[PDB]
Amino acid sequence: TETDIGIIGSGISGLQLALRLQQLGVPVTLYSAQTAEELGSGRPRNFPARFAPTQAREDSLGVHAWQFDDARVHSCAITIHGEGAPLEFAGALAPPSSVVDFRLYLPHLLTEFARRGGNVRIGPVVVDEVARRHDLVVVANGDRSMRELFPRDPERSPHTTPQRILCSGFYHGIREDVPHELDIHFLPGIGEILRIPFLSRLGPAHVLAFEAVPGGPLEAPAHLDAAADPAGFHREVLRLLAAYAPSLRERVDTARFGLVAPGELAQGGVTPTVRRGWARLADGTCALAIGDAWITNDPLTAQGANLGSHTAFALADLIASATGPLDEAFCRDASARLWDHARHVVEWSNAFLAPPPPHVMELFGRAAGDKQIADAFVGRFHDPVAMWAVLSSPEGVDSFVRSCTEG
Numbered sequence: 223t224e225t226d227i228g229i230i231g232s233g234i235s236g237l238q239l240a241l242r243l244q245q246l247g248v249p250v251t252l253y254s255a256q257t258a259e260e261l262g263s264g265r266p267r268n269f270p271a272r273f274a275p276t277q278a279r280e281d282s283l284g285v286h287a288w289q290f291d292d293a294r295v296h297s298c299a300i301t302i303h304g305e306g307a308p309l310e311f312a313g314a315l316a317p318p319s320s321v322v323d324f325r326l327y328l329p330h331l332l333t334e335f336a337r338r339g340g341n342v343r344i345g346p347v348v349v350d351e352v353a354r355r356h357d358l359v360v361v362a363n364g365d366r367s368m369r370e371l372f373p374r375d376p377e378r379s380p381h382t383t384p385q386r387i388l389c390s391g392f393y394h395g396i397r398e399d400v401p402h403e404l405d406i407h408f409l410p411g412i413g414e415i416l417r418i419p420f421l422s423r424l425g426p427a428h429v430l431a432f433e434a435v436p437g438g439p440l441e442a443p444a445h446l447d448a449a450a451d452p453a454g455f456h457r458e459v460l461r462l463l464a465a466y467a468p469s470l471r472e473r474v475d476t477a478r479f480g481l482v483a484p485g486e487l488a489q490g491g492v493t494p495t496v497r498r499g500w501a502r503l504a505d506g507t508c509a510l511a512i513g514d515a516w517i518t519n520d521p522l523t524a525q526g527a528n529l530g531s532h533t534a535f536a537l538a539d540l541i542a543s544a545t546g547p548l549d550e551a552f553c554r555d556a557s558a559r560l561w562d563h564a565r566h567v568v569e570w571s572n573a574f575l576a577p578p579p580p581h582v583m584e585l586f587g588r589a590a591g592d593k594q595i596a597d598a599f600v601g602r603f604h605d606p607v608a609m610w611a612v613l614s615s616p617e618g619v620d621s622f623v624r625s626c627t628e629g
Contacts, residue, residue: 227250232254253345268488272320288320302583315404323423359503378496379494387436394480401419
């Protein structure tokens with residue numbers, strides 16, 4: 223037909239857009255730098271949990287898999303360390319979120335797109351070459367984005383350097399109190415420590431993630447070459463766990479503790495950036511950005527992959543129902559529409575990087591003594607808009623607490 227879409231990048235957003243356009247009848251070509259086999263190898267880059275809305279999109283794409291508890295998180299346990307006793311509460315995540323290694327997930331999608339007749343082009347990409355071949359280019363590569371096509375929007379990008387320095391990897395050798403339960407430790411002015419059960423390509427494992435405030439003490443493991451000195455790395459990880467998350471340190475079977483394999487680790491920082499969602503290319507073909515090519519958030523709120531899955535389904539409906547040309551007016555309206563949802567994700571993600579305001583600290587206390595509140599709070603990780611409605615304003619916390627207390 224006439225609407226021919228060219229997608230660049232094999233992320234979750236690019237692959238789901240390809241699958242969804244294909245379901246809608248839109249001709250689509252995917253330009254991926256890697257093959258399916260290459261997508262299933264290499265060092266891991268991130269550890270995304272996919273909440274219920276993303277699984278529902280996966281349902282309608284006919285790609286739902288990993289339907290067993292080893293790839294699910296059913297409950298979240300939060301510990302806030304103060305100067306007094308640490309604030310502790312746990313709430314249920316119902317439905318569970320899916321914690322599947324993207325070296326299992328992304329090949330799953332790409333393979334199914336190709337098998338359904340999707341046209342897949344493997345190799346390096348020249349934007350103008352894609353623009354010669356399609357009516358619209360959708361860029362959906364990583365955080366590297368294009369940067370030439372989509373400049374950084376400063377009114378939506380309050381940060382310019384990473385707000386956390388990351389050290390995250392798959393580990394064996396941690397005993398588990400509650401199965402399929404996520405552990406978050408908030409260390410004010412220092413950072414966050416997370417332990418997430420996860421299904422990796424190397425089996426079930428523990429994601430031990432240090433989100434370090436830069437210059438603070440948690441930055442240490444992000445700068446150790448764990449391959450060059452495994453013993454030194456693990457010793458430093460255990461030391462920091464002992465210092466700041468002892469409830470986690472006590473569960474470490476030191477006989478088995480360590481990365482599940484050399485390289486199963488990601489270290490670095492992430493600079494939260496919101497870019498301009500559209501771009502006019504040389505020949506007049508326009509270009510839209512989704513996924514990390516458009517918006518980059520700090521992984522702490524775990525909304526990254528979910529936002530890209532949402533923006534893919536939203537952009538697809540716009541492309542598929544577009545009766546006019548896919549010109550700048552279309553792209554500007556599209557980007558505006560996508561930003562209306564993405565805004566809540568960016569502002570919530572940036573809020574969690576900052577010290578918790580008092581009305582947030584109050585909600586945590588209220589949830590520490592009311593299981594209905596803790597369950598309701600955790601359950602809203604499924605919905606970034608409903609979560610941001612609570613965390614933004616102090617009246618949002620109040621109106622939320624009231625609904626949980628039937629008052």
